[model samples]
Structures are given as C-alpha cells and as structure tokens.
Target: VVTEKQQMLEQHLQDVRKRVQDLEQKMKVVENLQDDFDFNYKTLKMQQLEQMLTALDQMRRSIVSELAGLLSAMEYVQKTLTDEELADWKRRQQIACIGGPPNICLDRLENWITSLAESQLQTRQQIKKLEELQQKVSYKGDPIVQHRPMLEERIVELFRNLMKSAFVVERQPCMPMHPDRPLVIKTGVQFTTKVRLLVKFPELNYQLKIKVCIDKRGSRKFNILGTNTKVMNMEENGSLSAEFKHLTLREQRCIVTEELHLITFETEVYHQGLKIDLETHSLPVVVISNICQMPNAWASILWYNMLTNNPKNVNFFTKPPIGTWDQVAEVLSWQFSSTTKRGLSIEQLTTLAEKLLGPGVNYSGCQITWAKFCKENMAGKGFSFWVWLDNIIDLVKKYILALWNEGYIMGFISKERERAISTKPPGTFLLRFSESSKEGGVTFTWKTQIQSVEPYTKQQLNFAEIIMGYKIMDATNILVSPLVYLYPDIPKEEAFGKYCR
Candidate 1:
C-alpha cells in the first residue's frame, strides 16, 4: 500500500516538473522577442505581450494549488503508515510481556518512516525553485503569488511533526532486580527505560535532552524521584538514545493498589531552524507495594496482556473479561518453557485442562474466568489455580528439578492410575505429583494395603524419609519401613539415594 502511494506521488511530481520546465522555456522565448520590437509597432506588441504574461501566470498559479494538495496527501500517507506500524508493534509487545517469542524490534519500522520523511523533504526541495520563478513573472492580481509562501510553511511544519513522531520509548520501564519482566514496577526500587530517536541525525547529538516522567493517575499519588532527564547522545554503534538508569518511586499515600501507571518520555529538538517538540510513552505499568505481591501482580499482568491488544486500556481490570482456554493455555505452556528450559507437552496440558475446565467437554471452546484463575480459592485447595501452578513452577526450579528433568516424577498421572499400581507386589511405590497441595508437592503411593503417603512439601529437605526408610510403629512398637523397593522392583537407594542433598 505504501509503495503504491509512493508511485502515485512520483507520477504527480513528474507532471509538475515537466510543466515548470515548459513554463520557464516559454518565458525565455517571449523575453528574446522583447528586444527585437520596432518603435512603430512596439506599443501594439507590448499590449499583446502583457496578455501573454497574464495567461502564463494563471497556469503557474494553477500548478501551485495542485502541488499544495499533493503535499497534503503525502503527509496523510506518512501519518497513516507510521500509525499502523506502531499499532502492530504495540500488539506484539503485549504478547511479548506474557512470555511470547520476542518480535518487538522497531528497526524496520523506523527505517521505513525515515525513508518516507526523506522523500517528502526531497519533494519540498524540488518545488522550492517555483518560488524564484513566481517572483520574476507572476501577475500582481494572481492569488498564487500570496499563496506560494503558505505552501512552503505547510511543508516545513509537516516535517517537524514527522520528526516528532519518530521519538519513541524503545524499551518499556522495568526493574533490574528481575530481568526480562517488564511493566511490573515495585515502589521505592529503581527502574530503567530506554528512550531513542528513530530519526538518527548527528546534528541532533548533545542538542536534545530527553526527560522522563511517571504518571501515577491520582490526586494523592506517588512522586517519581530520580534523574528524570538525560542528554540524548549518539553511541559508537551509530544509534541515538537516552537511557534512564536511576529512577525510583516514592508514594504519598500509605496504601497500594494494582493500578496502572504510564512512563512518558519527551524531548526538544532544534534542528535546521525547526524547533520540534518530540514525545512518546511506554506501555502501561503495574505498580506493586511489596515484593511478595509479585506473583499476584504478575498474574494480573499476564491476564491483561494476554487478552487486550490496545496499549492504552489501563482500566482493563475494572471489568476484566474471560479469556479462552486456548489463549491462557498457550501462555501457561510458555511459562514452563521460559523458566525451566522445558515446555508442557500436549498430554500434560490436556491433564491441566481437565483440572481447570473439568472433563468430558470440548476443551477448545472452554472459557477460563479470572476469578477461577487467581482471585478465588480452588475447590479443596487453600489457594487459586494460578497460585498452585506458580508454586509448582518454583518447586520444579528449587526442589525437584533433577527428578522432573530425569523423568523420575510422573507428574501428570491420574489417581485412578495409582490404584492400578496397588495390584503390584506389596512395598512397591510410585512417585506422582499432588493434585491438591497449594504449595506444590510430590507424594508416593505404595502397594501395602493401597496406602498413599503424605506429600513432601518444602519441609522435607531431601528424600531420606522415603529412601533410608519411612519410620512406622510395628505391633511391638518397633520402627520399620514398608518401602522396600521402588515400583516394579528397582531398589529405593538406586533410584533416589543419589539425588539426596
């Protein structure tokens, strides 16, 4: 679409260029005839030549009006293309916030805008010659004589607006305490954001100072405290940027809410006699009061970023909508892949889907409510489904990483399958993940009278209780362990003693 517009603009410029050249050539021919006129017929020739000049001026004015309209169209094309590209980048940023593959680079988008600006500037220079021609030959009564300078002013103003739009917040504000997680700001902690000018010009270096501000939307709000301004400078890699590395927040109010805030970046550029006021804003940020609130805050971030494509919808949580199972499921799978270097398989995800949406329904058409995910407690658990999942993720990283990675823990098995294991010999046991623990744990079910052991939470530092022996009171008050071997006759020490820390 942009290429088509470019071709059309070029064709119109071509016609205008040909007309200007033709008008200049004809004016010269009429001038050459001036010196050859005889005195007897000079008055008659002068009157006729005056009428010819008026005719030429009328055509010149007509061309001026057409060129003005062409400039307007070009400006509209530039604005529309940039707006569309920026919208797409914003959408991709939302997905990236929730562990989607990174695709938020703006280099190509910036290059296209820069090229368009250059073309527009070149076109403005092309028509600049017309002003000199108008001064020499235009009729006093032709309105184009007065309207010519207005066209020049409009193009210069348009160029300023284009450059201003090029100023962007390349990286959204994020805390360095936790890398790769953006838009989650913890009060009293320092955060950073990167401001960059897409229109890279060496002349702009050291001339423009970019300023940062946080808008915490309230009469009684948090004061943004830190180095709010930095000089925009060019790096050795040929990129112009201003990074805010030391910005912290201080709240005026005592309470905290999971509210949205905006980090705005602005700058002043005085380039080639055009003073451009440039500005751009980052993605909506979620502010937390304490570190422990991170899990809940992140849950909201995931839900909002996963469902909404609009970057300015800061009040999304006011009436949060239901997300389809497919959308949430994909993000859930990404959570595992991003943290553990592994992703949930279809079988594991199917088991989770059954747990969330219940069994015997078309999983694809299911909708997951926000309350079920994080707001309300599960049926028999003390925490929400997200809390359970979040706990499991941490448990995998901290406690049972080796077992999970080595495939010793069959995490997705059903309770019915554990019953089937009872048919094996007595003292045989199999490890499976707990279905009810909110803090996430793994339990083993043994075949001695079909008994399942208590889940091992963070309380058990190692598997010595199960491997060395689980103490039991015999009939004569003696300590004994029914756990003689792992399921299907593997020795307990051979299977798990090596993993004990």
Candidate 2:
C-alpha cells in the first residue's frame, strides 16, 4: 500500500490552501468598500479595513509555522522508514552470511524510496502553487515570502538525505574458505566485501571512491590491513558497486571468545555542485585469532546477530542473554543447511533439542544459554554443544556424505527406535549417528536379538570399511558386518552396493 501519510498530508495541504483563499476573499471585500460615503460611514469602513488587515497579517504568520510543522512531521516519517529498511537489509545480510537463504533483493526498498521521491515532488509543486497564488493576490504581511526560501532549502535537504540512504553494503565481509559463513574473520586470513549505490546515475561513474575502515571502538591495538578503498563503477551486471576483495586482520593478542567489530564503508558524492556524504556498515563481524576458535566464533556470530538487530551491540557476549529454543533451532539448522542443500529434519532437530535441553524434557519453551551452547564444555564431553554439532557436520561431509545425502542413514533417530528392529527379521539394520562422542561418529544396528556395534569415528576409514568388515580386537579374523538387509528388507547389496567398490 502507498504511504498513508502522503495522502493525509496532501489533504492537509489542500485544506490550508482553501483557508488562505477564504481569508483573501474576505480581505478583497473590505478593500472594495465605498470611498466617498457619509463621514460616519467612511470612519466605520476604515475601522473594518484595519481589522481585516490585522487578520490577514496574523494568518500569514500562522500558516508559515503550520507548513513548517507539516514538513517536519513528513521528514520524521521518511527518516524512520529509511532507517527501518536499512536495518532490515542488514539483518538479512547477517542471515545470508551464516549459511541461511540469500534474500538480498532490494525491489521493495527501491519502491519505497521512489514513493518518497514522488511525495517530495508533490510537496514542491504544491509550494510553487502557493507562491503563485500569493503573487496573484498580494497579502497584508511578508511572512510567507520571508520564510519561503527556508522551506525550499528544507525540501532540498530531504532529497539529499534520501539519496544518501541509498548507499548500502551489498556484500558482507567473508573469508574464501567459507564464503557462505560471513561476518567471521580469522586473523591473518583474507576476507572480502562489496558496497553499492542503489540509486544508479551514469554521471557518478568512477566519481565515488568508497573508503572502508574497521571501527574497533578504541579497543586495544589491532591492525586491519588490505584494500581499504575502491571507486564505485558500473558493473557488467548493470549495478554500481565497489568490491573490496582482500582484507586481513593482525592483532596483538588472542582471545577465546569473539570480538565484534564494524566494517564501515563511506563515500562523498559530488553531483550538480552539491557534496553528499553517504555511509553504510556491514553487519558486525566476529574477529578470531586462530582456526580452532572458528566454530565458537560462528556460534557467537549466530547468537549475536539473532539476539539483536543493533550492530552497535559489540559487547553482546559480555552478558549474553538466553535465547528461546525456537530462535536457537533455526540458526542451528542453518549450519547444516548452508553446507548441505537441505536443513535438519524434524527428527534431527529434536535430537539436537534432546542434547541441548536435556532428554525427555519439554522443549516448547526451552531456553538455550550462550555458555551451554558454545562456551562451556558438555558434561563429560571435551567440547561445547556447538563444537559437537559442528564436528558432526564436518564428519558427515568428510566421510558418510553419500549415504547421508542419499537418505540411507537415519542419522538422528533415537537408540530406542533402532532397538525396535528386534521385531524385524534377522539382519534387518539401520545406520544412525552418535550423540555423546566428541569426535562425532556413526553406528549401525541389526536385529540378531537387537545388536548395535560401536560408532565408527576417525577419517582413516570410510563408510565402506564399516559395511565391508569390522576388524575384531584380536586382529585375527575380520568379522563380517551383521548389517545385511537395509532396515526393511532391502538387500545390503541393493542398498549400498554402489557405495562400496
């Protein structure tokens, strides 16, 4: 829908015009009174003329202030809309960086800006009409004429602000290793980002040099190095953009947790002899000192981005709040979906819920604390909950991807579900994932009175090693795997024959 405020403001403007016309009509009647009438009549007519003149002067002053109020209100509304859309785009960028769907379309935002432009154009035209009316039928006071220039300048400033808001970060800073995993920068590694001017004007080509800088908020010494400047140019794809391809961070010390920093892109546009300063910032990035901290760093990124839309909240982790299960689950699922084409199944997510919230507990209103998620180690396990899941993702991608991708492995089923195979024929088996092990492994269960072998961990052996044979501890006779029929009577050869040589 069109902005309701525009329609309302236009109506208000029309009413003011009508009021001004009505006042002018009353003044005209007093101006054309009999000049050489009786002495008493002339005296009374002069008093009437004086009273109408005073009213006309007072109305001029009141209308000028009224117009100012209306314009001021319109400016506030436009500013709020601009701020909201930019914040929304930044939020979407944050999600895209963390392996979520890429929803960077600016069609709606462009439409909104266009509507604002149209509204401003209408206001300008209405002001011109009022000036013409004033010239045609001169009023008693010069208040409107005196303040008209100020009003015109205010409208110009509105246009300038709208243009400035068009500049935005088109691509967030991300490393080459995981381009999908954005806003997390590793020390000594190169990351890239791009900025774009939404309102494309050919004259601006090569005129705007978008400068980049990392705003560390006066924290300790940190040297951010790389290409910090690029001029915006029209791309082959018909967009004006500047891509900063290589940026590296070198810091004095390393911290276990992530430190948030903002990457600001600023530019000065000189068009029509007017200088407009435009600036935009990438979503806050998590700067880590080492590779081992990457997983936790991503965890912090996910939590902080989802926790608040305000990128300035850099000290988020210092007192991180609890997230609802719904919010945490969505972000957690993105970790897998970003790598694999599909996200976690309901069963898979529930398995994570069991691990994070506790077994057999109500998960509907469950809250996930930051410490339990990625900071503290799981009870008896050597890593945090996030580390466990991250390792499992790597494990699946590294070894059992074929089986996992093909749906042969029911990776998140409960042990009790696997035990249900006892009712099936002998050799009926299914593959499932491990829960407690830090390294992250997979196991298979068969119905020879319901037996489950130990999960296979280490990357040295692949899925074939598990299916072909399991070496007994004695290292003498290689016992054949009991997994024969695939779950519900499909032959082992039919199920995984292609997977094994």
Candidate 3:
C-alpha cells in the first residue's frame, strides 16, 4: 500500500510539471504582445509632442517679427512728429520775437498736431490688425499642410478672375468711301462713251443730276445739252444707263469733243436739296518725255485737286505717282511768296510751313530746317524735299488764323535742285510780313539762300522762275482760291537777322 501511494504521488508530480511548462509558453507570447503595444503608444505620443512644440515655436516667431515691425514703424512716426513739432515751435518763437501776429502761426501748429494724431491712430489700427492675423496663424512639423490645398485653390481662383478682368473686347468703327463722279473724256473719234456712277453703300439712296456745258471758258456760254432729270434707284451690283444714236455730226462732235475735252463735268447729289453733295471728276492726262517731267505735272495735279476738290473742308486723296520733290517745291515757293507779300511774319510763316508739311515732314526728318529758327541743332537723316514742302504748306494753312490773330501773315518758299551739288545747295526760303501800305498790307522777302542745280538736259528751264508768283489768299480759308500770281520778282534775302549756314 505504501509503494502504490508513493507511485501515485510521483505521477501527480509529473502532471503538475507538464501543466507548469504549458503556462510558461503562454506567458512568453503575452509578454511579447504587451511590449509591441507599449512601443507603438510611445512613438505616437512622441510625434504629437514634436508637432505641438514646432507649432508653438512658429507662433512665437511670427508674433516676434510682427511686434518688431510695429515697434519700428511707431518709432519712425514718433520721430517724424517730434521733429515737425520742434520745427513749428521754433518758427512760432521767431514770430513771437518779431512781434508778428501769432494767431495764424498758432493755428497752423494746432492743425499739424491734429493731423499727426490722426495719422498715428490709423497706423496703430493697421498694426493691431496685423497682430491679430499673426495670432491666428501657426506652424507645425508639417507647416501649412492642413490648409495648403485650400490656399492653393483660392490662389488659382483669384488668378482666373484677374485674367478675365484684364482682357477686354472692343468694337472698331466703320469708314465710309467717297467716290468721284461726272467724269469727262476728250476725244474726236465718233465713238460711244460710257458713264458709270457707283455708290459705296447700297442701302443709302442717292439723287444724281448730270449736266453738259459747252464753251466752258466763254462768258456767253450756255448749257447745250442736259439730262431729263431721271430718277434712278441704285441696287447692289446694279447700274442705270442712257443711250443716244442717229444724231447729226454737230451733235456727235459736241458729245465726243465734250466727252474728250470736257473741262467741267458736274454730278450733284441732293438729299432733299437741303444737304447737297457734289463731286467733280476731271482727268488731266499729260504726256511726259522724261522722269524729271513728273514733278511739274504732279504739282499741277495737286494744285488742281486742292482747288477743284475744295480740300479746305474735304480731305484730298493721294495715291502712288504723286508729285515729285521739285514740283512740290515750286508750288510751295509760289504759295509762300504770295502769302508773305500779303502780310505774314517770320514766326507765322514758320508755323504755317509746319502745318502745310503735314505729319509727313516729321516722318521725313525735315523738321531740322524748321528747328533752325528756334536755335536748335538741325541734325537728322532721310529727309524728302517734296514731303517737307507739302508739310510746310499744310502747317501754314493750319496756323494762319492763329498768326492773323497775332497780326501777321505766314509763308515759305523752297527752291532746291532735284539732285544735290558740290556747293551746299541753296537753302530753303523763309519769309514774313507785318504791315506795308505800299505793297498791299505787308511785304515779303527771301529769308534763306536759294538752292540751284545744273540742268540734267538741254532744256535750260528755270523752275524757280516758273513758280515765282503763285499766291495763296486768306491763308486761313480752306475754300479761298484763285491761288494766283503776286509780284514778278522773287524776294531777296535780308541781311539783318540769322541766315541758314
């Protein structure tokens, strides 16, 4: 019985040892899990603490920077105010010492003080707002990370709005076209000629009256033929025509000669006759033998256009093959001599020449010639004599009224060679007049040297002599004309004032 009991005790001990080994293995696994949980929790807590510290540091920096700026601004303002006040006090003391009235000085000082106070108060308010903004902003380990996307979206929206506002749409104005009518053809052949009138806008209705006048230069001349007052409606791409045949030789000659040598053909359009628009179309076709002949012909055409077209109110149109330099110079010289002879002065003449020249003078760099009068250096390149002359004529007309108001008439004459020569070519002629009872109202003479050139051919033609007496009347009136001749001799240069070198 004792042996059996001891054996039972040994078996019980073995079972207990097995149970203890199992509990040891389970405790090892639970220890490993607890260690992992503790490590994760510590890491998370450390990250949170780091972020909070970073944010606090950023907040402190922002606050410190803002405070420093505020302090600097306040110091500057206080210094400025103190200096101003001190200066005012010194000024008042001086006034008191002089025994002068102090009321005005005291009032000024008080006003200054009030202005300074108001300025300081406004500055303080701005600083306070800046401080509040600084307090609201903070930084962390991931600075601005939370609000970064929102800020970026706002910036993009603002940029889009700005672009939309900066770009604008604009409408352009429409220009109307004015065409020439009443064309005349000069021919002796028994041929049929066609007359066509075109209106730019089809929507607008126009009334046209065509008339034929024979012996245009004679005083007793009468209208030999006339249109039966035809009423025509113009359509887009449509035309109205009148044809005549089976006529006598005199009639044919009249039509052909008038068509060929028609000096004055007129087309008058009336909108209720209250608003009358008349355009004259006359073609002066000249046959020229040389390229140099172009200038004379062109000048004649320009004068004709200026006179006939009535450019005083209506603008004249110029195309290619316009007048040459010599031709324009000749015409301008005549116009200037005539104007100055009437009563224009030097200053007025200069202003008028500038106007006649138009903007083309500046473009051509001929402003150098005019600049000489103002005692300015005449230095430039690429000048066109013709363009300069044209500009001078235009300038004269534009400022003539102003000159007249100042009691003077204005004029300029340019006589230069088509080609440059060795001796500094004759310079431009500038003339002026105030009052001269003997020579009408005023007298004119050449103010500058005349440029001369040898003839390219054997013509022996003197351009200066040809354009000698051309005159411009009422230099201010656009419709003023007859642009006739003045004195027989060109003005001689005076020796008193400055002359062109």
Per-candidate clashes come to 0, 0, 30
Q: For candidate 1, write residues 322-359 as lDDT tens digits.
A: 98888888998887667666767776777777777766
Candidate lDDT scores, in order, read: 0.70, 0.70, 0.31
Highest TM-score: which candidate? 2
lDDT of 2 by residue, 1-501 (tens): 435654654444445445445444543442232122223354664565455546555655655675576577557656655666566676777677666677777655655554565555555554554465356435546665777677777866886888778777787788988765578878789888888776666777888888887763446445668777888998855556899888888875664446777778888877655678799887877777677777888788888877777767777877898988887888767767777756687777786687677676657678778887877887666777888888788877667776576567777776776677767677777887677787787888872577677887866553764676654444455554445788778887767777777
The C-alpha RMSD in Å for every predicted model, in order, reads: 6.6, 7.6, 35.9
Model 2 TM-score on a 0 to 1 scale: 0.77
The global Cα lDDT (0 to 1) of model 2 is 0.70
Which rank order by lDDT, best down to worst?
1, 2, 3
| Superposed Cα deviation of residue 216, candidate 1 (Å) | 6.9
Candidate 2: list runs displaced more than 4 Å: 1-86, 114-144, 216-218, 252-256, 461-465, 468-482
